[PDB]
Amino acid sequence: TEEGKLVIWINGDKGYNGLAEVGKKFEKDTGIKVTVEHPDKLEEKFPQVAATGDGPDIIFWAHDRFGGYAQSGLLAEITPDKAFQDKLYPFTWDAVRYNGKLIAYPIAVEALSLIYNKDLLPNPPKTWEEIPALDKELKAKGKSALMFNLQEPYFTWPLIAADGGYAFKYENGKYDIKDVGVDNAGAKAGLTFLVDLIKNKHMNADTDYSIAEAAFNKGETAMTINGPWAWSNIDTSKVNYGVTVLPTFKGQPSKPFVGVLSAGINAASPNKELAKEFLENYLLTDEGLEAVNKDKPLGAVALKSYEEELAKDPRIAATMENAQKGEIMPNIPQMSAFWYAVRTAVINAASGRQTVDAALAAAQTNAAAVKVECLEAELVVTVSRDLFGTGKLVQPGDLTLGSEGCQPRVSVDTDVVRFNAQLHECSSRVQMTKDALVYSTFLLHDPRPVSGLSILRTNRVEVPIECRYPRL
Ligand SMILES: OC[C@H]1O[C@H](O[C@H]2[C@H](O)[C@@H](O)[C@@H](O)O[C@@H]2CO)[C@H](O)[C@@H](O)[C@@H]1O
Ligand SMILES: [Ca+2]
Ligand SMILES: [Ca+2]
Ligand SMILES: [Ca+2]
């Protein structure tokens, strides 16, 4: 990274052009150039380049990633005076605190809502259970009831959590990273409902963000599920849409994960002063947040003034109604593992490649004990040796990645076994989606032969190991 300027990363669905306007104001006033970029997979690339001392000066993402970044020494501690803290809501500062330190600036509060075409559907269904029958009606006139992104677990999690799914159990003031709530009866019920919607052809397992967005904004489907950033494009489509409560499932509300868009400062930036100035006195103002929101709505911004100004907007009100019914995302480093786990499970259940029960059990194991890192042509799998929480440590020789042709390098620590594998050699399965090439294999723990009687929790366990790379 180079000093005298600022490089900013932010996701491509956010208002990066408005942010660039803020940067242009900054530049004119101070002479310091600001370059805003939106690389794909930036939440995964940032730790890779920041660990070598490179990467952007500022990284934007929902707060849930930042704990990992902070645990890895990648984030500078931020030091706002008391007055600036008084300018933002306490909930948001809470979201960006890790081990008693502030590790990023809160920007805005995000939550999914149900977005619906008022002309096609004047009265949105209050329950998921209605949607199959409703779909029938709409299918009779060449339309669908619901389409939304099924490739990212962020969008399916509300249904999964409604009847009792959860990420990590919060207990005694801390999250128990071995107590994952993706494999309980409620999560299984929610995912079964989703997979049923697919099997009965009310939804297609391949639908992604762009497909669902195009369908809804063209008037081909009566509903979608999305956050404030999407509203802009809908406005341009001139569809007459409303933003409202997500449907219930078995009488309980959908529970979306509440995100807080946050901006962290790279620990290796030589421009930490400039970054603080830009964030506090340029972006986190009525003018800055106004520009960014005008591009792609931010939601309920953390700055009290502009949030009070925008609360009249009923869409913000529905976003916050849904947020209240949901849970704030943890920011612990294990969230990435959680997300990988659920992602894989959902896809594999939606395709029918795996049952719901098996997919969610494997996701429990993956979130609790496995970390997948996908590199150019190589894969790294890190397995917790305390695989079942018993405190009994697995031996490396009982762990196998892939089939016999897969011959990884295996390294052992006190607490983990790490597999460094060649993707071509270890891919059991390859396939293409619209947007990605997918390489897939499995991790197996099989201690047999073992002399003792196997009882209760089984010692044989198999989890999906998968990497997705953009098609270009
Ligand atoms: O799907 C897993 C993904 O969910 C969240 O990402 C959201 C993000 O919060 C929103 O700002 C918007 O970009 O949609 C994203 C999902 O595509 C988590 O914050 C992220 O860590 C997680 O991977
Ligand atoms: Ca569990
Ligand atoms: Ca696409
Ligand atoms: Ca706009």
XYZ file of C-alpha atoms in Angstrom, residues 24-206:
183
model
C -13.935 13.326 -4.376
C -15.076 15.913 -1.838
C -12.297 14.685 0.439
C -9.770 15.005 -2.394
C -10.766 18.514 -3.428
C -10.678 19.747 0.158
C -7.355 18.096 1.036
C -5.602 17.064 -2.203
C -5.525 13.392 -1.150
C -6.857 11.059 -3.822
C -9.389 8.355 -2.912
C -9.857 5.194 -4.980
C -12.928 3.039 -4.295
C -12.835 -0.571 -5.510
C -15.321 -3.438 -5.219
C -13.389 -6.666 -5.846
C -15.272 -9.934 -5.830
C -14.843 -12.047 -2.694
C -13.288 -9.065 -0.904
C -14.209 -10.476 2.499
C -11.989 -13.470 1.704
C -9.247 -11.595 -0.174
C -8.691 -8.907 2.471
C -7.206 -11.268 5.096
C -4.938 -12.845 2.467
C -3.396 -9.566 1.285
C -3.552 -7.762 4.631
C -1.497 -10.543 6.225
C 1.373 -9.778 3.799
C 1.255 -6.079 4.704
C -0.724 -5.025 1.612
C -4.411 -4.531 0.845
C -6.654 -1.494 1.116
C -6.491 1.302 3.646
C -10.166 0.825 4.574
C -12.342 -2.282 4.255
C -16.141 -2.160 4.353
C -18.228 -5.181 5.280
C -20.947 -6.296 7.640
C -19.572 -6.419 11.147
C -19.626 -10.224 11.349
C -16.264 -10.647 9.604
C -14.303 -8.117 11.601
C -13.662 -10.219 14.697
C -11.712 -12.635 12.537
C -9.747 -9.777 11.024
C -9.047 -8.399 14.490
C -7.949 -11.741 15.876
C -5.451 -11.969 12.996
C -3.873 -8.597 13.743
C -5.225 -7.015 10.555
C -7.182 -4.089 12.019
C -6.084 -0.867 13.648
C -7.840 0.155 16.835
C -10.065 3.156 16.195
C -10.062 6.065 18.639
C -13.091 8.366 18.383
C -13.460 10.950 21.129
C -16.521 10.789 23.383
C -18.504 13.246 21.243
C -18.231 11.199 18.075
C -19.357 8.107 19.982
C -22.341 10.138 21.233
C -23.118 10.803 17.563
C -23.772 7.074 16.835
C -26.193 4.567 18.374
C -24.906 2.287 21.180
C -26.131 -0.871 19.411
C -23.807 -0.176 16.476
C -20.705 0.447 18.587
C -21.582 -2.803 20.369
C -21.588 -4.510 16.970
C -18.047 -3.312 16.183
C -16.400 -4.177 19.518
C -14.114 -7.210 19.906
C -12.372 -8.296 23.111
C -13.144 -4.925 24.638
C -11.784 -2.882 21.734
C -13.454 -0.930 18.957
C -12.208 -2.404 15.679
C -14.281 -0.535 13.105
C -16.627 2.370 12.496
C -20.325 1.439 12.333
C -22.011 2.790 9.210
C -25.490 1.338 8.877
C -27.899 -1.346 10.084
C -29.059 -3.949 7.551
C -31.789 -6.558 7.598
C -33.708 -8.443 4.944
C -37.346 -7.742 4.235
C -40.045 -9.231 2.050
C -40.380 -7.107 -1.096
C -43.616 -7.571 -2.998
C -45.234 -6.402 -6.229
C -48.354 -4.525 -5.130
C -50.082 -4.777 -8.522
C -49.626 -8.563 -8.742
C -50.322 -9.168 -5.060
C -52.184 -6.448 -3.126
C -52.159 -8.510 0.083
C -48.841 -10.276 0.752
C -49.079 -13.682 2.431
C -48.308 -13.550 6.127
C -47.108 -17.171 6.252
C -44.706 -19.314 4.256
C -47.268 -22.120 4.305
C -49.544 -20.062 2.006
C -46.935 -19.696 -0.729
C -47.326 -23.016 -2.611
C -51.058 -22.500 -3.144
C -50.448 -18.837 -3.979
C -47.802 -19.878 -6.499
C -50.419 -22.045 -8.206
C -52.663 -19.046 -8.804
C -49.797 -16.991 -10.174
C -48.526 -19.876 -12.294
C -51.922 -19.883 -14.016
C -51.148 -16.398 -15.389
C -47.490 -16.953 -16.258
C -46.005 -15.673 -13.005
C -44.267 -16.994 -9.907
C -44.988 -16.175 -6.283
C -41.457 -15.989 -4.881
C -37.874 -15.824 -6.118
C -34.796 -14.938 -4.095
C -31.123 -15.757 -3.835
C -30.685 -19.413 -2.803
C -26.908 -19.554 -3.228
C -26.045 -17.481 -0.150
C -27.181 -18.725 3.269
C -27.814 -15.124 4.349
C -31.132 -15.196 2.466
C -32.344 -18.640 3.568
C -31.307 -18.284 7.214
C -34.529 -16.477 8.285
C -36.603 -19.524 7.359
C -34.038 -21.899 8.924
C -34.003 -19.976 12.200
C -37.756 -19.352 12.462
C -38.598 -22.656 14.162
C -35.427 -22.836 16.250
C -32.264 -22.597 14.182
C -29.367 -20.602 15.570
C -25.675 -20.013 14.841
C -23.782 -20.284 18.143
C -25.403 -20.535 21.549
C -24.770 -17.522 23.772
C -24.244 -18.691 27.330
C -22.471 -17.223 30.376
C -21.584 -14.056 28.481
C -19.801 -15.873 25.640
C -20.621 -17.854 22.520
C -20.020 -21.597 22.773
C -18.252 -22.281 19.491
C -19.024 -25.999 19.706
C -22.779 -25.469 20.277
C -24.054 -24.848 16.738
C -27.793 -24.686 16.165
C -27.943 -25.642 12.489
C -28.866 -29.307 13.100
C -31.879 -29.069 15.427
C -35.503 -29.858 14.644
C -36.375 -26.251 13.815
C -33.543 -25.726 11.350
C -34.319 -29.082 9.751
C -37.989 -28.123 9.514
C -37.196 -24.801 7.853
C -34.807 -26.288 5.336
C -37.220 -29.135 4.589
C -39.843 -26.512 3.793
C -37.409 -24.780 1.419
C -36.422 -28.039 -0.291
C -40.112 -28.883 -0.631
C -40.759 -25.542 -2.308
C -38.032 -26.568 -4.739
C -39.128 -30.178 -5.315
C -42.728 -29.114 -6.000
C -41.271 -26.595 -8.478
C -42.346 -23.405 -6.708
C -38.682 -22.361 -6.736
C -35.608 -23.377 -8.693
C -32.476 -24.471 -6.843
C -30.322 -22.465 -9.297
